[PDB]
């Protein structure tokens, strides 16, 4: 995708994450654990629901039309009736092919984008108390117990609290 996260600097997905589309894995003093990020997950889902509902939006209702199958050879008029229908079908078939191509390219790019948005948001939360390893993982340079992780994940992590500690561990 355009943002280079999904199938990019993040090597692969997590089959184990079943409660969300994007989220967090951590290792600290107290062990390892996993949690879904709801906001990013919902942003992707809402956008996909949006496009799905636009695409399946019932556009047409038709009643008496032209005949499209014929039991006798007639020539000119029937040639025209068939050509009109064949022309229509090819144009609709093209629209359908193009629609899914554009939709799907965009769906991949937007999901890639939401991964990236969450990554950049987290980086910004952590300020000078962590560093980007380049594989979608931050090395946090301080004691971050389960309370501290959950604070990063739920948006309450004050960086000023751990700054002195983390700055020291970084610049050695």
């Amino acid at each position: 995708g355009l943002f280079g996260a999904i199938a990019g600097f993040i090597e692969n997905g997590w089959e184990g994450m079943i409660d969300g589309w994007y989220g967090f894995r951590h290792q600290n003093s107290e062990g390892t654990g996993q949690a879904a990020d709801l906001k990013s997950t919902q942003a992707a889902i809402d956008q996909i629901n949006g496009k799905l509902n636009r695409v399946i939006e019932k556009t047409n209702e038709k009643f008496h039309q032209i005949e499209k199958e014929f039991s006798e050879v007639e020539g000119r008029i029937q040639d025209l009736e068939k050509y009109v229908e064949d022309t229509k079908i090819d144009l609709w078939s093209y629209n359908a092919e193009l629609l899914v191509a554009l939709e799907n390219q965009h769906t991949i790019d937007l999901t890639d984008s939401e991964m990236n948005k969450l990554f950049e948001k987290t980086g910004r939360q952590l300020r000078e108390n962590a560093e980007d390893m380049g594989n979608g993982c931050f090395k946090i340079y301080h004691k971050c117990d389960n309370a501290c992780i959950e604070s990063i994940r739920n948006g309450t992590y004050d960086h000023d609290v751990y700054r002195d500690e983390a700055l020291n561990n970084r610049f050695q």
């Binding site: 692969n12 589309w21 951590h26 899914v100 939709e103």
Partner: protein, 317 residues
């Protein structure tokens, strides 16, 4: 002693392939189908009024072939013609059959109003063993076969004004005998003539005498014509022989009515979209079942599948 915090995304073990601008096939976590490719094989009887033609074409129901008498004054949203349909009355043709079928199908009714035509000096209600009504000879219910009274067939000249505020459809015809003996025996004059007119139009038909292939006991034929009379206009019928006269008119409507050729059985269910293969759901925007449809239907396309991605790129472990 610090901590590692990894950002990531889900994957699934068995993804689905979709098409994009750049890729013929690329794997995503999930997709949904946009092409309806199946039918139940049955035409749902709601919410459209479905009229099963059974053994009758719309035209035979219109003319009043005796085995189609059950269709008198019927109405429909969709008239369904079956491949088993057959004619069983006097042999006939309709120049521009397709147009008459279309305009009637589209009107959605066979509501017929009898009018008091006065045919002075001819015998009315002619019939044939080609068109049995009960045990005896008969004819199309909506047509009146006129022949000589005594030894004369005078010039018929009649009018019927339209003083209603709707259009009238008149169905009428011309008899084509096989021999000169038949012509003179039925109509006296050696050559007949039928002129049907309004203020705006006129049709004149000369009968042709000659054998046609034998069908249901006759080498003769009837040719069927139609005339629409608008409010304030007047019908005139003029003939010195061979007239197959109207008994009245059909009331015309405009609306959502049509006709479809199908052998699918009718069932009790609800479906907006009908194809000759049967009803189909209309939750998807496209369909590959049949280019012939009626109602709120997905648009016909040539592809049998098109997958809309409903998830991210699938990158498994």
């Amino acid at each position: 002693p610090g901590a590692t915090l990894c950002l990531g995304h889900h994957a699934v073990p068995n993804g689905t392939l979709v098409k994009t601008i750049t890729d013929d096939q690329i794997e995503v976590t999930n997709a949904t189908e946009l092409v309806q490719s199946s039918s139940t094989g049955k035409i749902c009887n709601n919410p459209h009024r479905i009229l099963d033609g059974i053994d009758c074409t719309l035209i035979d129901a219109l003319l009043g072939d005796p085995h189609c008498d059950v269709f008198q004054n019927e109405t429909w949203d969709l008239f369904v013609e079956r491949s088993k349909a057959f004619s069983n009355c006097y042999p006939y043709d309709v120049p521009d059959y397709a147009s008459l079928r279309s305009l009637v199908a589209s009107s959605g009714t066979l509501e017929f109003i009898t009018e008091g035509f006065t045919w002075t000096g001819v015998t009315q209600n002619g019939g044939s063993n080609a068109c049995k009504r009960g045990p005896g000879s008969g004819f199309f219910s909506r047509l009146n076969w006129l022949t000589k009274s005594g030894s004369t067939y005078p010039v018929l000249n009649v009018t019927m004004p339209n003083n209603d505020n709707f259009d009238k459809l008149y169905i009428w015809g011309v008899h084509h005998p096989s021999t000169n003996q038949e012509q003179t025996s039925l109509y006296v004059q050696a050559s007949g003539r039928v002129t049907v007119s309004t203020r705006r139009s006129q049709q004149t038909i000369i009968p042709n005498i000659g054998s046609r292939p034998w069908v249901r006991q006759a080498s003769s034929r009837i040719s069927i014509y139609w005339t629409i009379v608008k409010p304030g206009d007047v019908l005139v019928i003029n003939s010195n022989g061979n007239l197959i006269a109207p008994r009245g008119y059909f009331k015309m409507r405009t609306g959502k009515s049509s006709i479809m050729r199908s052998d699918a059985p009718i069932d009790t269910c609800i479906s907006e979209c009908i194809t000759p293969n049967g009803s189909i759901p209309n939750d998807k925007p496209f369909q590959n079942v049949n280019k012939i449809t009626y109602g709120a239907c997905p648009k016909y396309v040539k592809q049998n599948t098109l997958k809309l991605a409903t998830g991210m790129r699938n990158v498994p472990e």
